[PDB]
Design a protein around this ligand. Structure first.
Ligand SMILES: CC(C)(COP(=O)(O)OP(=O)(O)OC[C@H]1O[C@@H](n2cnc3c(N)ncnc32)[C@H](O)[C@@H]1OP(=O)(O)O)[C@@H](O)C(=O)NCCC(=O)NCCS
Lengths: 311, 360, 154, 97, 93
């Protein structure tokens, strides 16, 4: 019929299975199938990538009514499997996948190995946030399973180095069902403040950075992302070793989420009244506030000129 | 992507990048450079006279000289002829030359055979301290004890001399034939503890050592790869930096040496020289075999970065200098003129430059 | 190029009570016959935070302009303080005199105006909500900012 | 792991000099900013180097005069530290809104 | 090292927030000319805004003048004639 090309964005259908299997398309497939995001050689191509809603056991099934036998034709399934955890994906056998994740759910005690960070109730439902390091083996497995979402929904995302111990990972789960709602990979940098500050006390101080932030499409737009950002920022404010809160190359979506929640936080502390009542504020006051909030300087100035446009 | 094409690019961008550049081709390639502590003397017509110690390397061709030269800089640097004020015949060649901090007239040199010499600008060769029997690269004066000198050679031996007293300067006050199993790539004195000094070896070990103590070693660090140079900060007593074959510049806290604070990337080959700034707390300069010099601002480690400049490099890389066309043998920051740098390349070129940033 | 030109402005009542009307003696020149009318507008910046607080005080049209040197007395009542933020009536603000020929603005003159209490007792402890009658304005007319634009005359 | 070079003597050329005279803002980030502005304009026109130099000189003159007037407005407010309000007033003096 | 969004962007690179490239010390120096002795802390964003507004207007006028001359390159003289539209200013009469 002369239609042996298709779009990897509509050909790839990601699924997350609870009692209902929720399906959705990816935002970017180019790091997998090239900048064209076009796959040639397959007629009526479907790529089913499914994850168990609790263990995220991957299952890949590539269906096509016809595929050209030429050597140059790309191998969709092999391409895709190169990015999923090696020897951890059930390919084209649904019963095997179901058995596997059913026997994994029996012993999958996520909340028992990670360190609790905080809870929060949303729409009348309790959700939990957990923190883990990427050197732990179970953390490594779960991260390699949920890692492909970084590539599929975050432009320019790249897999991170798991040998590096500075990587922290926050997991957002449903407390009563154990379904993984989202994850945030963050990194700690050393923060030099001058010979005096660094010489005073022994404790290494850090610039904490949010590197990857993902809420799975099914659970998006329910308030989750905001609650997760606020829980992480709160745990970092309570932490003595953190001195700045940064974010890597945020796109407009995360830009707006960040600005919304940061303005909310600053309003809860009465900075709106302070900044609308005074323009004489001394540099000591500005610096003390900027460091108490643990906000980056540029973001701090943005938020100041924002709070000045209230009411 | 050729050396000469890259150089044409660099000299096309020279105006926008530097407040001052001065290229000078040397008869023989100098292996060491150091600014002398000459107070800024006002001259006629907006000239400023600075002095330099340079060496020679003829490789058995002709006689080598410790050269004292004088550069004239425009007055604007503070806020056109290069002359040799003095020469001195020198045995073999100078690998590193450091003037005594407390006495700018003395000058210590180490040659390709490990012999250490003490020259005087006024008279010349004053002392011949001979303890090493192999080419040595490490030579450091203590800025706290007048006449306390550390020398380090390829024969695993480190030597401590005292030239402050007039008695027996020729013999070493202490020796260590057993501090490392291999070449001493460099040793440096601490800038606040008059009894601490650090060494780096090809045995891929970095040792913080004490002189008073009998241990003589109070911290050891396994390096990823061998370290070629190290430097202590001029503002913090607990902070040091090191660089070696893996092109990353590591930073260490002296109170917890088990783990590098942070390592900065950006060099494409081994790094041979490294020095902290004496003016701006947190500025570090490095040079390597990639013909590149790089200035980092420690206070920018892991800072937020607008994506436009994100591709440009890690946020802690203040600037890069690619005017050299071959491996950089040595360089020095002017202790009186901040951000004024002198550098010497393998291809008989001595550059004197100041970058245009002006923001610490 | 320009056919009409501002030779000078001169405020008459300055300093003056905050409510006294604005009076400007404007001396200008006309080099040749023009058909349209000159238009004098006077705007008062009610607040520095935003622009919606501007107040166009009063426009005045004159015509035809007689060739030669002309004197014109331009008056306009003080601003409406019901439209000025209670907090920003006292202090430094700006006024803008604008002369335009046939809807085309050819001269803009920016002035700083300082609103101060008359007695030291008040300026040292300004009452909660200001006392209008004891406010005095002083428009610093020594060196106003005179921007000149090129238009088409006829 | 230093590598000792082989001494290659230089006869003649086997000496260039560059000094700097300019304005306050540095030249490169201003080219950055002007290219950013030209991008958001859908424009495709070439921008000559001397044209960017003239833009820079004019921007600096404008900012210096605006700071003159802002410092002046602050003087007449009896203080010495110039605030947002004084910058806004000064900018309102030129006809900006 | 330590980055997870350091891959290869799907599309072209676009310039954002190059205004922030106006270093605070640069604004401070410009303020020193004109005799600004002390400057507040939250004044920098307004100076950014004003500078960007003025430069946008001037560049737009330059593009208008050049496009009107039926040419494809804006030259220094085009910028002169664009600044012309800003009017001639004097303090006093
Ligand atoms: C960014 C992301 C985490 C948002 O997750 P989310 O669960 O949809 O977030 P929220 O539930 O907080 O809803 C966010 C939106 O609600 C808005 N909002 C407005 N009023 C609100 C309120 N009263 N309560 C909550 N949210 C509110 C937020 O400002 C934001 O703006 P928008 O509604 O105009 O889009 C999600 O889009 C995602 O994971 N995307 C993947 C790709 C990506 O961009 N990742 C992050 C980049 S590193």
């Amino acid at each position: 019929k002369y239609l042996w090309t298709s779009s990897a964005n509509e050909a790839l259908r990601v699924s997350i299975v609870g009692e209902n299997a929720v399906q959705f398309s990816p935002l970017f497939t180019y790091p997998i199938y090239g900048d064209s995001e076009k796959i040639y050689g397959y007629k009526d191509l479907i790529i089913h990538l499914a994850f168990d809603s609790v263990t995220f056991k991957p299952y890949v099934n590539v269906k096509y009514s016809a595929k050209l036998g030429d050597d140059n034709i790309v191998d969709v399934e092999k391409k895709l499997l190169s990015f999923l955890p090696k020897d951890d994906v059930i390919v084209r056998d649904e019963a095997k996948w179901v058995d596997c994740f059913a026997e994994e759910r029996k012993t999958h005690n996520l909340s028992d190995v990670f360190e609790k960070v905080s809870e929060y109730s949303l729409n009348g439902e309790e959700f939990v946030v957990y923190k883990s390091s990427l050197v732990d083996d179970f953390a490594r497995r779960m991260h390699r399973r949920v890692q492909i979402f970084s590539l599929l929904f975050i432009e320019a995302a790249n897999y991170i180095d798991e040998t590096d111990p500075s990587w922290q990972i926050y997991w957002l789960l449903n407390k009563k069902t154990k379904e993984l709602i989202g994850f945030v990979t963050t990194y700690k940098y050393w923060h030099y403040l001058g010979a005096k500050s660094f010489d005073e006390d022994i404790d290494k101080k850090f610039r904490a950075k949010i590197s990857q932030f993902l809420i799975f499409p099914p659970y998006q737009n329910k308030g989750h992302g905001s609650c997760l950002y606020e829980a992480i920022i709160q745990s970092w404010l309570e932490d003595k070793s953190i001195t700045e809160i940064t974010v890597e190359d945020p796109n407009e979506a995360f830009d707006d989420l960040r600005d919304r929640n940061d303005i909310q936080r600053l309003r809860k502390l009465g900075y709106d009244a302070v900044f609308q009542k005074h323009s004489d504020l001394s540099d000591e006051f500005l610096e003390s506030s900027r460091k108490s909030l643990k906000l980056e300087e540029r973001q701090f100035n943005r938020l100041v000129e924002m709070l000045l446009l209230l009411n | 992507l050729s050396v000469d094409e890259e150089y044409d690019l660099w000299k096309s961008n020279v105006p926008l990048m530097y407040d001052f550049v001065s290229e000078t081709r040397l008869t023989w390639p100098s292996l060491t450079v150091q600014w002398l502590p000459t107070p800024v003397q006002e001259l006629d017509g907006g000239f400023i006279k600075q002095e330099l110690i340079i060496g020679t390397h003829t490789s058995g061709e002709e006689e080598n000289y410790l050269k004292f030269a004088e550069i004239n800089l425009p007055k604007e640097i503070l806020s056109s002829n290069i002359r040799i004020t003095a020469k001195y015949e020198h045995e073999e060649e100078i690998t590193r030359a450091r003037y005594m901090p407390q006495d700018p007239n003395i000058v210590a040199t180490i040659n390709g055979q490990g012999t250490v010499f003490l020259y005087s600008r006024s008279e010349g060769l004053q002392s011949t301290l001979k303890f090493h029997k192999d080419n040595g690269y490490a030579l450091s004066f203590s800025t706290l004890v007048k006449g306390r000198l550390l020398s380090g050679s390829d024969d695993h031996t480190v030597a401590l001399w005292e030239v402050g007293s007039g008695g027996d300067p020729t013999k070493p006050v202490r020796t260590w034939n057993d501090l490392h199993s291999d070449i001493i790539n460099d040793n440096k004195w601490h800038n606040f503890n008059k009894d601490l000094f650090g060494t780096v070896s090809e045995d891929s070990l970095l040792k913080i050592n004490d002189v008073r103590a009998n241990n003589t070693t109070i911290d050891t660090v396994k390096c990823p790869q061998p370290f070629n140079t190290l430097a202590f900060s001029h503002h913090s007593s607990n902070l040091l930096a090191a660089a070696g074959m893996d092109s990353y510049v590591y930073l260490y806290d002296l109170r917890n040496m088990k783990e590098p604070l942070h390592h900065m990337s950006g060099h494409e080959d081994a790094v041979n020289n490294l020095e902290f700034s004496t003016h701006v707390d947190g500025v570090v300069v490095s040079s390597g075999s990639d013909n590149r010099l790089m200035m980092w601002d420690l206070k920018q480690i892991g800072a937020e970065q607008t994506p436009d400049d994100a591709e440009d490099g890690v946020p802690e890389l203040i600037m890069v200098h690619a005017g050299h066309r071959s491996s950089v043998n040595d360089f020095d920051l002017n202790p009186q003129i901040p951000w004024l740098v002198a550098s010497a390349e393998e291809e008989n070129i001595l550059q004197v430059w100041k970058c245009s940033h002006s923001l610490p | 190029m320009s056919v009409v030109s501002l030779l000078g402005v001169k405020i008459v009542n300055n300093p003056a009570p905050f409510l006294a009307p604005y009076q400007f003696e404007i001396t200008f020149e006309c080099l040749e016959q023009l058909q349209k009318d000159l238009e004098w507008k006077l705007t008062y910046v009610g607040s520095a935070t935003s622009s919606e607080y501007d107040q166009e005080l009063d426009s005045l049209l004159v015509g035809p302009i007689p060739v030669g040197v002309n004197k014109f007395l331009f008056e306009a009542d003080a601003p409406d303080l019901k439209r000025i933020p209670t907090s920003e009536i006292l202090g430094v603000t700006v006024i803008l005199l604008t002369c335009s020929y046939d809807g085309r603005e050819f001269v803009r003159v920016g002035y700083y105006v300082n609103n101060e209490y008359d007695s030291e007792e008040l300026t040292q402890d300004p009452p909660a909500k200001p006392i209008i009658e004891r406010i005095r304005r002083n428009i610093l007319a020594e060196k106003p900012r005179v921007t000149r634009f090129a238009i088409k005359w006829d | 792991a230093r590598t000792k070079q082989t001494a290659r003597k230089s006869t003649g050329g086997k000496r260039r000099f560059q000094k700097s005279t300019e304005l306050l803002i540095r030249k490169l980030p201003f080219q950055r900013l002007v290219r950013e502005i030209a991008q958001d304009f859908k424009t495709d026109l070439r921008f000559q180097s001397s044209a960017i130099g003239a833009l820079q000189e004019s921007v600096e003159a404008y900012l210096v005069s605006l700071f003159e007037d802002t410092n002046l407005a602050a003087i007449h407010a009896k203080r010495v530290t110039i605030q947002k309000k004084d910058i806004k007033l000064a900018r309102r003096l030129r006809g900006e809104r | 090292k330590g980055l997870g969004k350091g891959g290869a962007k799907r599309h072209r690179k676009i310039l954002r927030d190059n205004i922030q490239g106006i270093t605070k010390p640069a604004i401070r120096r410009l303020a020193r000319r004109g005799g600004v002795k002390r400057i507040s802390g939250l004044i920098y964003e307004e100076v950014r805004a004003v500078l960007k507004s003025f430069l946008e207007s001037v560049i737009r006028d330059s593009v208008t003048y050049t496009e009107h001359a039926k040419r494809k390159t804006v030259t220094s003289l085009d910028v002169v004639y664009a600044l012309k539209r800003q009017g001639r200013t004097l303090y006093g009469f």
